[PDB]
């Protein structure tokens, strides 16, 4: 079978980040321990900082940083030479001088499997396409149930379930374009 | 000062509730006891059945009932012959027969007053609208900070953050039409 399940939001771009301004970067870890991570925020320059991790609610964390300079500033969180899913991430200070699909980040478990009747979950990142539309379909065997929290800082969180196990395409796109890994195949298996 | 914060999102219609289901309506606590409220669900013939509470996910409680015919049920959540923000909640069995902004219910302490800088909050039930786009605007002093959490049962759970105290409006708005009590007067109070 194919069946297919849509949402869709519209919001503005995340408002102007002002140099020596407290930022954060959030991320859910849906199958990693927070515990050991590291966290750098690179410079336009290529100066690295050490950045601190915190809770900032239930299952969400934080890497809390304050740039110096205007530009795009890359945030890494890793365990030894392992990024976490959506790190690298990219973190523009001033004007936004790009926007688009291609600036969207994704990660998380319900991008590449899951088991049936179980939630799938994943994370996207949309500060850096500036203002439109998230798109976020699944199409497969069965129709999904699609639940997702979208957030002032651009960040998205989505937790779906299907019913049957089998192939499933999930597909996130803004401004009616494909983000750079989209489509995901995704396998869910049985009970 | 008069600036306006808006978020959009499209959903496609609640999947058809059946005769023998499992219907759920899901809301914040009052400020009151689970133990202390009492629920009923009407059938399309006046017949009322007290119907359980129980807590379901991110905090919030459910209303579980099984229809037993087609047409429009009624479930109410009250304190004596008081009814919770939103209550009495309509439930169609078998297809929808109407649609729209007419049809969407809302409330909480975010379309009533709040506090400069803290957290406001509210809910939606858009099942009985149908397939649409719901549209959240909050018009005041300052630009709000908006985050909500769309739900699989039609529902969207809103926190909005403003920064200024005074008199700000927030719209509601389901294919671009004021739903019944919108657009909400709402005082925020200094901090």
Redo the contacts between chains.
């Keep these: 079978n194919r069946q297919t ?8 771009a995340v ?1 102007l980040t002002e140099v020596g301004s407290q930022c954060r970067l959030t991320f859910k870890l849906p199958g990693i321990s927070p515990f050991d991570l590291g966290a750098t925020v690179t410079s336009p320059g290529g100066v690295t900082e050490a950045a601190e991790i915190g809770e900032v609610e239930d299952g969400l964390y934080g890497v809390n940083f304050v740039p110096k300079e205007l530009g795009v500033h890359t945030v890494s969180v890793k365990y030894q030479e392992m990024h976490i899913p959506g790190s690298p991430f990219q973190f523009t200070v001033g004007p936004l001088k790009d926007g688009g699909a291609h600036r969207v980040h994704a990660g998380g478990p319900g991008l590449e499997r899951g088991e049936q009747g179980m939630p799938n979950e994943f994370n996207v990142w949309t500060r850096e396409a500036g203002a439109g539309s998230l798109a976020i379909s699944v199409e497969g065997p069965s ?1 999904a ?8 800082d651009g960040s998205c969180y989505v937790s779906y379930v299907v019913a049957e196990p089998g192939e499933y395409r999930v597909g996130i796109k803004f401004n009616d374009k494909h983000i750079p890994d989209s489509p995901y195949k995704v396998y869910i298996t049985p009970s």
């Design positions: 399940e849509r949402i869709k939001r519209q919001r503005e408002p129709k149930e699609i639940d997702f929290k979208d957030r002032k």
